[PDB]
Design a protein around this ligand. Sequence first.
Ligand code: C8E
Ligand code: C8E
Ligand code: C8E
Ligand code: C8E
Ligand code: C8E
Ligand code: LDA
Length: 183
Amino acid sequence: EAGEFFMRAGSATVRPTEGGGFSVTNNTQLGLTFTYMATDNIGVELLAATPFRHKIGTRATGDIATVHHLPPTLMAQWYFGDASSKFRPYVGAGINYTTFFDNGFNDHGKEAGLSDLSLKDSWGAAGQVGVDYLINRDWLVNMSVWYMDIDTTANYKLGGAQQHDSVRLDPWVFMFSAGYRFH
Ligand SMILES: CCCCCCCCOCCOCCOCCOCCO
Ligand SMILES: CCCCCCCCOCCOCCOCCOCCO
Ligand SMILES: CCCCCCCCOCCOCCOCCOCCO
Ligand SMILES: CCCCCCCCOCCOCCOCCOCCO
Ligand SMILES: CCCCCCCCOCCOCCOCCOCCO
Ligand SMILES: CCCCCCCCCCCC[N+](C)(C)[O-]
């Protein structure tokens, strides 16, 4: 597999970790991954996706603002078994980068006096465990479980300027996908 380059396309579901309430909704997007096989086990993977849309809310108010973000992640991977194996599970470690954007309070949020919402970027440790089933020499199916440190702060104006709340997304990411190989 050394020298190989493959791409996976599939769904990438993001399940944040418990951010009244103040909770963040789950969300699935088109997840694409680009991996380069350093040497039959070591590979470099890049995770990309369509922009994620999340909702924020108190069980008292219901949704009150919606958020968007790109969580690109770079990872060093270890593929168990040899090139010849057709069932190659793997573990990976790397760094994450999330960029929030196009964030805003609902009408109801506004009603409650919320305004001007924005979130600062994030960087963090990231790890994964997943398996690639190599059907043909050109195709594979795949599952993957990621975990990323995605801590960030929200700045808004509740009536005046109570704009400082930390948000700990620390999401678990699941990805079911198929992939094509370019030797
Ligand atoms: C880098 C950001 C990605 C957004 C750009 C769109 C990229 C273009 O299309 C790539 C083709 O991917 C689409 C295929 O459908 C997904 C695969 O089927 C899933 C298997 O369960
Ligand atoms: C072989 C083609 C199947 C295409 C794969 C795309 C996956 C299907 O849609 C999932 C819809 O997103 C919302 C579901 O909740 C997240 C849980 O993961 C579900 C899929 O196994
Ligand atoms: C070659 C074997 C593949 C297995 C990877 C294990 C390699 C060891 O861990 C690397 C960890 O890299 C991530 C560091 O944490 C993120 C740093 O903070 C980012 C900047 O603010
Ligand atoms: C809450 C915990 C959820 C527990 C999930 C257990 C999931 C464990 O791994 C399942 C891996 O899938 C196995 C593959 O299918 C068997 C052989 O491959 C088939 C190709 O013809
Ligand atoms: C020659 C074709 C071989 C193709 C192999 C098909 C293997 C497909 O996957 C079997 C395992 O899928 C079952 C598990 O349920 C889906 C995951 O759990 C969802 C939420 O965490
Ligand atoms: C991804 C996290 C986005 C955070 C959105 C910020 C929500 C702040 C919550 C305002 C609480 C409103 N209040 C007073 C009516 O309860």
